PDB file of all heavy atoms in Angstrom:
ATOM      1  N   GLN A   1      -4.445   1.996 -12.113  1.00 12.23           N
ATOM      2  CA  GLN A   1      -4.837   3.219 -12.778  1.00 12.23           C
ATOM      3  C   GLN A   1      -3.869   3.688 -13.854  1.00 12.23           C
ATOM      4  O   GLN A   1      -4.247   4.322 -14.795  1.00 12.23           O
ATOM      5  CB  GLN A   1      -5.063   4.323 -11.752  1.00 12.23           C
ATOM      6  N   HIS A   2      -2.590   3.434 -13.669  1.00 10.54           N
ATOM      7  CA  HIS A   2      -1.584   3.907 -14.587  1.00 10.54           C
ATOM      8  C   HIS A   2      -1.140   2.802 -15.541  1.00 10.54           C
ATOM      9  O   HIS A   2      -0.083   2.919 -16.154  1.00 10.54           O
ATOM     10  CB  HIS A   2      -0.391   4.463 -13.788  1.00 10.54           C
ATOM     11  CG  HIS A   2      -0.703   5.728 -13.071  1.00 10.54           C
ATOM     12  ND1 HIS A   2      -1.252   5.746 -11.805  1.00 10.54           N
ATOM     13  CD2 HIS A   2      -0.567   7.018 -13.447  1.00 10.54           C
ATOM     14  CE1 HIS A   2      -1.477   7.001 -11.449  1.00 10.54           C
ATOM     15  NE2 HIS A   2      -1.060   7.790 -12.425  1.00 10.54           N
ATOM     16  N   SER A   3      -1.924   1.726 -15.632  1.00 13.68           N
ATOM     17  CA  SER A   3      -1.605   0.565 -16.458  1.00 13.68           C
ATOM     18  C   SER A   3      -0.180   0.035 -16.249  1.00 13.68           C
ATOM     19  O   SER A   3       0.486  -0.351 -17.199  1.00 13.68           O
ATOM     20  CB  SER A   3      -1.811   0.883 -17.945  1.00 13.68           C
ATOM     21  OG  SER A   3      -3.094   1.441 -18.151  1.00 13.68           O
ATOM     22  N   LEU A   4       0.254   0.001 -15.001  1.00 15.44           N
ATOM     23  CA  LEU A   4       1.556  -0.508 -14.649  1.00 15.44           C
ATOM     24  C   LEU A   4       1.454  -1.905 -14.016  1.00 15.44           C
ATOM     25  O   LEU A   4       0.873  -2.048 -12.928  1.00 15.44           O
ATOM     26  CB  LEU A   4       2.188   0.463 -13.645  1.00 15.44           C
ATOM     27  CG  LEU A   4       3.627   0.268 -13.209  1.00 15.44           C
ATOM     28  CD1 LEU A   4       4.516   0.616 -14.360  1.00 15.44           C
ATOM     29  CD2 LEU A   4       3.948   1.165 -12.027  1.00 15.44           C
ATOM     30  N   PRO A   5       2.037  -2.937 -14.660  1.00 17.23           N
ATOM     31  CA  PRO A   5       2.022  -4.277 -14.062  1.00 17.23           C
ATOM     32  C   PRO A   5       2.896  -4.338 -12.811  1.00 17.23           C
ATOM     33  O   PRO A   5       3.889  -3.664 -12.717  1.00 17.23           O
ATOM     34  CB  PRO A   5       2.569  -5.155 -15.175  1.00 17.23           C
ATOM     35  CG  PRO A   5       3.387  -4.242 -16.026  1.00 17.23           C
ATOM     36  CD  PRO A   5       2.752  -2.906 -15.947  1.00 17.23           C
ATOM     37  N   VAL A   6       2.505  -5.132 -11.842  1.00 15.85           N
ATOM     38  CA  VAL A   6       3.268  -5.306 -10.629  1.00 15.85           C
ATOM     39  C   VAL A   6       3.866  -6.719 -10.673  1.00 15.85           C
ATOM     40  O   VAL A   6       3.171  -7.667 -11.041  1.00 15.85           O
ATOM     41  CB  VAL A   6       2.365  -5.144  -9.421  1.00 15.85           C
ATOM     42  CG1 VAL A   6       2.998  -5.637  -8.133  1.00 15.85           C
ATOM     43  CG2 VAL A   6       1.973  -3.669  -9.247  1.00 15.85           C
ATOM     44  N   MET A   7       5.143  -6.836 -10.304  1.00 16.88           N
ATOM     45  CA  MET A   7       5.825  -8.128 -10.113  1.00 16.88           C
ATOM     46  C   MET A   7       5.751  -8.426  -8.645  1.00 16.88           C
ATOM     47  O   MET A   7       6.209  -7.632  -7.868  1.00 16.88           O
ATOM     48  CB  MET A   7       7.285  -8.043 -10.562  1.00 16.88           C
ATOM     49  CG  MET A   7       7.405  -7.722 -12.046  1.00 16.88           C
ATOM     50  SD  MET A   7       9.289  -7.606 -12.586  1.00 16.88           S
ATOM     51  CE  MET A   7       9.732  -9.507 -12.592  1.00 16.88           C
ATOM     52  N   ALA A   8       5.151  -9.545  -8.275  1.00 16.12           N
ATOM     53  CA  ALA A   8       4.975  -9.965  -6.865  1.00 16.12           C
ATOM     54  C   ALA A   8       6.112 -10.878  -6.455  1.00 16.12           C
ATOM     55  O   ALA A   8       6.234 -11.998  -6.944  1.00 16.12           O
ATOM     56  CB  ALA A   8       3.650 -10.711  -6.704  1.00 16.12           C
ATOM     57  N   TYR A   9       6.971 -10.386  -5.571  1.00 16.09           N
ATOM     58  CA  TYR A   9       8.049 -11.214  -5.022  1.00 16.09           C
ATOM     59  C   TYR A   9       7.683 -11.816  -3.691  1.00 16.09           C
ATOM     60  O   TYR A   9       6.682 -11.441  -3.120  1.00 16.09           O
ATOM     61  CB  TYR A   9       9.345 -10.402  -5.006  1.00 16.09           C
ATOM     62  CG  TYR A   9       9.635  -9.363  -3.944  1.00 16.09           C
ATOM     63  CD1 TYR A   9       9.844  -9.713  -2.632  1.00 16.09           C
ATOM     64  CD2 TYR A   9       9.849  -8.047  -4.284  1.00 16.09           C
ATOM     65  CE1 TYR A   9      10.212  -8.765  -1.671  1.00 16.09           C
ATOM     66  CE2 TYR A   9      10.227  -7.090  -3.357  1.00 16.09           C
ATOM     67  CZ  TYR A   9      10.439  -7.460  -2.045  1.00 16.09           C
ATOM     68  OH  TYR A   9      10.841  -6.560  -1.113  1.00 16.09           O
ATOM     69  N   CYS A  10       8.430 -12.815  -3.241  1.00 19.01           N
ATOM     70  CA  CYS A  10       7.987 -13.703  -2.136  1.00 19.01           C
ATOM     71  C   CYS A  10       6.518 -14.124  -2.218  1.00 19.01           C
ATOM     72  O   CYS A  10       5.797 -14.106  -1.229  1.00 19.01           O
ATOM     73  CB  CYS A  10       8.259 -13.067  -0.769  1.00 19.01           C
ATOM     74  SG  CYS A  10       9.976 -12.596  -0.538  1.00 19.01           S
ATOM     75  N   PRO A  11       6.068 -14.616  -3.391  1.00 15.09           N
ATOM     76  CA  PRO A  11       4.629 -14.943  -3.513  1.00 15.09           C
ATOM     77  C   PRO A  11       4.201 -16.156  -2.729  1.00 15.09           C
ATOM     78  O   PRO A  11       3.000 -16.366  -2.525  1.00 15.09           O
ATOM     79  CB  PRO A  11       4.452 -15.161  -5.007  1.00 15.09           C
ATOM     80  CG  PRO A  11       5.789 -15.671  -5.441  1.00 15.09           C
ATOM     81  CD  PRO A  11       6.786 -14.847  -4.658  1.00 15.09           C
ATOM     82  N   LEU A  12       5.174 -16.947  -2.295  1.00 14.80           N
ATOM     83  CA  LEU A  12       4.917 -18.104  -1.442  1.00 14.80           C
ATOM     84  C   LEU A  12       5.323 -17.783  -0.008  1.00 14.80           C
ATOM     85  O   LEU A  12       5.450 -18.689   0.805  1.00 14.80           O
ATOM     86  CB  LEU A  12       5.699 -19.318  -1.930  1.00 14.80           C
ATOM     87  CG  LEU A  12       5.413 -19.802  -3.355  1.00 14.80           C
ATOM     88  CD1 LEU A  12       6.297 -20.996  -3.642  1.00 14.80           C
ATOM     89  CD2 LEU A  12       3.948 -20.209  -3.489  1.00 14.80           C
ATOM     90  N   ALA A  13       5.501 -16.501   0.308  1.00 17.69           N
ATOM     91  CA  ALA A  13       6.027 -16.075   1.609  1.00 17.69           C
ATOM     92  C   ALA A  13       7.345 -16.826   1.906  1.00 17.69           C
ATOM     93  O   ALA A  13       7.615 -17.172   3.060  1.00 17.69           O
ATOM     94  CB  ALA A  13       4.986 -16.319   2.692  1.00 17.69           C
ATOM     95  N   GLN A  14       8.169 -17.083   0.872  1.00 16.13           N
ATOM     96  CA  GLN A  14       9.374 -17.931   1.024  1.00 16.13           C
ATOM     97  C   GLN A  14       9.042 -19.347   1.537  1.00 16.13           C
ATOM     98  O   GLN A  14       9.634 -19.827   2.494  1.00 16.13           O
ATOM     99  CB  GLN A  14      10.455 -17.272   1.915  1.00 16.13           C
ATOM    100  CG  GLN A  14      11.003 -15.991   1.317  1.00 16.13           C
ATOM    101  CD  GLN A  14      12.079 -15.350   2.166  1.00 16.13           C
ATOM    102  OE1 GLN A  14      11.929 -15.201   3.367  1.00 16.13           O
ATOM    103  NE2 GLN A  14      13.171 -14.957   1.528  1.00 16.13           N
ATOM    104  N   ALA A  15       8.131 -20.010   0.827  1.00 15.15           N
ATOM    105  CA  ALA A  15       7.557 -21.296   1.227  1.00 15.15           C
ATOM    106  C   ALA A  15       7.098 -21.229   2.692  1.00 15.15           C
ATOM    107  O   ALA A  15       7.380 -22.122   3.475  1.00 15.15           O
ATOM    108  CB  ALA A  15       8.535 -22.430   0.999  1.00 15.15           C
ATOM    109  N   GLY A  16       6.409 -20.137   3.036  1.00 15.62           N
ATOM    110  CA  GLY A  16       5.786 -19.955   4.328  1.00 15.62           C
ATOM    111  C   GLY A  16       6.648 -19.408   5.456  1.00 15.62           C
ATOM    112  O   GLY A  16       6.082 -19.026   6.496  1.00 15.62           O
ATOM    113  N   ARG A  17       7.985 -19.386   5.242  1.00 12.75           N
ATOM    114  CA  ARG A  17       9.015 -18.994   6.255  1.00 12.75           C
ATOM    115  C   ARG A  17       8.812 -17.578   6.730  1.00 12.75           C
ATOM    116  O   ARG A  17       9.219 -17.235   7.839  1.00 12.75           O
ATOM    117  CB  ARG A  17      10.450 -19.086   5.710  1.00 12.75           C
ATOM    118  CG  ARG A  17      10.923 -20.493   5.386  1.00 12.75           C
ATOM    119  CD  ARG A  17      12.394 -20.538   4.969  1.00 12.75           C
ATOM    120  NE  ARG A  17      12.656 -20.013   3.617  1.00 12.75           N
ATOM    121  CZ  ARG A  17      12.416 -20.649   2.457  1.00 12.75           C
ATOM    122  NH1 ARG A  17      11.862 -21.858   2.428  1.00 12.75           N
ATOM    123  NH2 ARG A  17      12.718 -20.049   1.308  1.00 12.75           N
ATOM    124  N   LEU A  18       8.205 -16.755   5.875  1.00 13.89           N
ATOM    125  CA  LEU A  18       7.856 -15.394   6.270  1.00 13.89           C
ATOM    126  C   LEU A  18       6.711 -15.270   7.324  1.00 13.89           C
ATOM    127  O   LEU A  18       6.834 -14.500   8.263  1.00 13.89           O
ATOM    128  CB  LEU A  18       7.580 -14.537   5.025  1.00 13.89           C
ATOM    129  CG  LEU A  18       8.837 -14.260   4.209  1.00 13.89           C
ATOM    130  CD1 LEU A  18       8.498 -13.301   3.083  1.00 13.89           C
ATOM    131  CD2 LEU A  18       9.964 -13.686   5.071  1.00 13.89           C
ATOM    132  N   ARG A  19       5.619 -16.017   7.164  1.00 15.33           N
ATOM    133  CA  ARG A  19       4.491 -15.934   8.086  1.00 15.33           C
ATOM    134  C   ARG A  19       4.197 -17.323   8.624  1.00 15.33           C
ATOM    135  O   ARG A  19       3.745 -18.185   7.857  1.00 15.33           O
ATOM    136  CB  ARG A  19       3.264 -15.376   7.365  1.00 15.33           C
ATOM    137  N   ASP A  20       4.472 -17.528   9.920  1.00 15.27           N
ATOM    138  CA  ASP A  20       4.268 -18.816  10.626  1.00 15.27           C
ATOM    139  C   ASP A  20       2.854 -19.422  10.479  1.00 15.27           C
ATOM    140  O   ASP A  20       1.921 -18.909  11.064  1.00 15.27           O
ATOM    141  CB  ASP A  20       4.582 -18.651  12.129  1.00 15.27           C
ATOM    142  N   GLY A  21       2.731 -20.546   9.782  1.00 13.54           N
ATOM    143  CA  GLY A  21       1.447 -21.191   9.621  1.00 13.54           C
ATOM    144  C   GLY A  21       0.581 -20.942   8.405  1.00 13.54           C
ATOM    145  O   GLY A  21      -0.575 -21.339   8.391  1.00 13.54           O
ATOM    146  N   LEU A  22       1.103 -20.261   7.407  1.00 16.18           N
ATOM    147  CA  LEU A  22       0.391 -20.183   6.146  1.00 16.18           C
ATOM    148  C   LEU A  22       0.285 -21.550   5.483  1.00 16.18           C
ATOM    149  O   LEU A  22      -0.770 -22.005   5.119  1.00 16.18           O
ATOM    150  CB  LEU A  22       1.172 -19.264   5.223  1.00 16.18           C
ATOM    151  CG  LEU A  22       0.481 -18.716   4.001  1.00 16.18           C
ATOM    152  CD1 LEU A  22      -0.901 -18.210   4.275  1.00 16.18           C
ATOM    153  CD2 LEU A  22       1.324 -17.677   3.292  1.00 16.18           C
ATOM    154  N   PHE A  23       1.410 -22.227   5.395  1.00 14.04           N
ATOM    155  CA  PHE A  23       1.450 -23.564   4.865  1.00 14.04           C
ATOM    156  C   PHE A  23       0.798 -24.592   5.760  1.00 14.04           C
ATOM    157  O   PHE A  23       0.188 -25.515   5.284  1.00 14.04           O
ATOM    158  CB  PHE A  23       2.858 -23.954   4.477  1.00 14.04           C
ATOM    159  CG  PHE A  23       3.264 -23.444   3.125  1.00 14.04           C
ATOM    160  CD1 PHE A  23       3.469 -22.122   2.914  1.00 14.04           C
ATOM    161  CD2 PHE A  23       3.424 -24.300   2.075  1.00 14.04           C
ATOM    162  CE1 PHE A  23       3.827 -21.654   1.674  1.00 14.04           C
ATOM    163  CE2 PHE A  23       3.795 -23.837   0.831  1.00 14.04           C
ATOM    164  CZ  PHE A  23       3.991 -22.511   0.632  1.00 14.04           C
ATOM    165  N   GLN A  24       0.972 -24.417   7.062  1.00 16.66           N
ATOM    166  CA  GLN A  24       0.494 -25.356   8.074  1.00 16.66           C
ATOM    167  C   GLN A  24      -1.002 -25.141   8.460  1.00 16.66           C
ATOM    168  O   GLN A  24      -1.448 -25.655   9.467  1.00 16.66           O
ATOM    169  CB  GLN A  24       1.417 -25.290   9.309  1.00 16.66           C
ATOM    170  CG  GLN A  24       2.904 -25.424   8.993  1.00 16.66           C
ATOM    171  N   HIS A  25      -1.760 -24.421   7.628  1.00 15.42           N
ATOM    172  CA  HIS A  25      -3.149 -23.996   7.895  1.00 15.42           C
ATOM    173  C   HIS A  25      -4.214 -24.970   7.367  1.00 15.42           C
ATOM    174  O   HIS A  25      -4.319 -25.209   6.156  1.00 15.42           O
ATOM    175  CB  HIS A  25      -3.387 -22.618   7.248  1.00 15.42           C
ATOM    176  CG  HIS A  25      -4.579 -21.873   7.786  1.00 15.42           C
ATOM    177  ND1 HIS A  25      -5.863 -22.370   7.723  1.00 15.42           N
ATOM    178  CD2 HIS A  25      -4.683 -20.646   8.351  1.00 15.42           C
ATOM    179  CE1 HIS A  25      -6.702 -21.494   8.248  1.00 15.42           C
ATOM    180  NE2 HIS A  25      -6.012 -20.437   8.637  1.00 15.42           N
ATOM    181  N   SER A  26      -5.054 -25.465   8.280  1.00 16.31           N
ATOM    182  CA  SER A  26      -6.024 -26.540   7.995  1.00 16.31           C
ATOM    183  C   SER A  26      -6.979 -26.250   6.856  1.00 16.31           C
ATOM    184  O   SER A  26      -7.281 -27.124   6.047  1.00 16.31           O
ATOM    185  CB  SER A  26      -6.878 -26.829   9.233  1.00 16.31           C
ATOM    186  OG  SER A  26      -6.061 -27.211  10.304  1.00 16.31           O
ATOM    187  N   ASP A  27      -7.513 -25.038   6.848  1.00 18.56           N
ATOM    188  CA  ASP A  27      -8.506 -24.656   5.857  1.00 18.56           C
ATOM    189  C   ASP A  27      -7.869 -24.488   4.520  1.00 18.56           C
ATOM    190  O   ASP A  27      -8.493 -24.768   3.510  1.00 18.56           O
ATOM    191  CB  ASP A  27      -9.237 -23.383   6.255  1.00 18.56           C
ATOM    192  CG  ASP A  27     -10.015 -23.552   7.524  1.00 18.56           C
ATOM    193  OD1 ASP A  27     -10.730 -24.564   7.686  1.00 18.56           O
ATOM    194  OD2 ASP A  27      -9.924 -22.663   8.380  1.00 18.56           O
ATOM    195  N   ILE A  28      -6.615 -24.068   4.497  1.00 17.24           N
ATOM    196  CA  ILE A  28      -5.933 -23.943   3.230  1.00 17.24           C
ATOM    197  C   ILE A  28      -5.504 -25.305   2.756  1.00 17.24           C
ATOM    198  O   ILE A  28      -5.582 -25.585   1.563  1.00 17.24           O
ATOM    199  CB  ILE A  28      -4.731 -22.993   3.336  1.00 17.24           C
ATOM    200  CG1 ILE A  28      -5.268 -21.582   3.620  1.00 17.24           C
ATOM    201  CG2 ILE A  28      -3.922 -22.952   2.051  1.00 17.24           C
ATOM    202  CD1 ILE A  28      -4.199 -20.620   4.050  1.00 17.24           C
ATOM    203  N   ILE A  29      -5.057 -26.148   3.686  1.00 18.60           N
ATOM    204  CA  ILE A  29      -4.740 -27.511   3.356  1.00 18.60           C
ATOM    205  C   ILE A  29      -5.993 -28.205   2.799  1.00 18.60           C
ATOM    206  O   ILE A  29      -5.912 -28.868   1.772  1.00 18.60           O
ATOM    207  CB  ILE A  29      -4.150 -28.273   4.562  1.00 18.60           C
ATOM    208  CG1 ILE A  29      -2.675 -27.887   4.730  1.00 18.60           C
ATOM    209  CG2 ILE A  29      -4.271 -29.785   4.364  1.00 18.60           C
ATOM    210  CD1 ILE A  29      -2.061 -28.287   6.061  1.00 18.60           C
ATOM    211  N   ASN A  30      -7.136 -28.067   3.474  1.00 19.87           N
ATOM    212  CA  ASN A  30      -8.375 -28.692   2.994  1.00 19.87           C
ATOM    213  C   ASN A  30      -8.768 -28.166   1.634  1.00 19.87           C
ATOM    214  O   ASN A  30      -9.170 -28.922   0.750  1.00 19.87           O
ATOM    215  CB  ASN A  30      -9.527 -28.497   3.983  1.00 19.87           C
ATOM    216  CG  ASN A  30      -9.332 -29.307   5.230  1.00 19.87           C
ATOM    217  OD1 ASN A  30      -8.514 -30.227   5.234  1.00 19.87           O
ATOM    218  ND2 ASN A  30     -10.043 -28.973   6.292  1.00 19.87           N
TER     219      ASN A  30
END
C-alpha cells in the first residue's frame, strides 16, 4: 500500500536449516 519494497532475508530458510524438510520434500523435489 505504501509502495515500499521488501527485502526477503533467509529466502532459502538457510538452505532449509531453518525448517526441517523443506529441501527434503518429495513434492517440491518432484
Side-chain angles (χ1 to χ4, degrees), residues 2-18 21-23 25-30:
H2 291 87
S3 309
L4 187 71
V6 166
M7 298 180 75
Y9 79 67
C10 305
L12 300 179
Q14 296 181 313
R17 294 185 286 283
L18 291 186
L22 196 45
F23 278 70
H25 198 300
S26 301
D27 297 314
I28 294 167
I29 281 166
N30 290 344

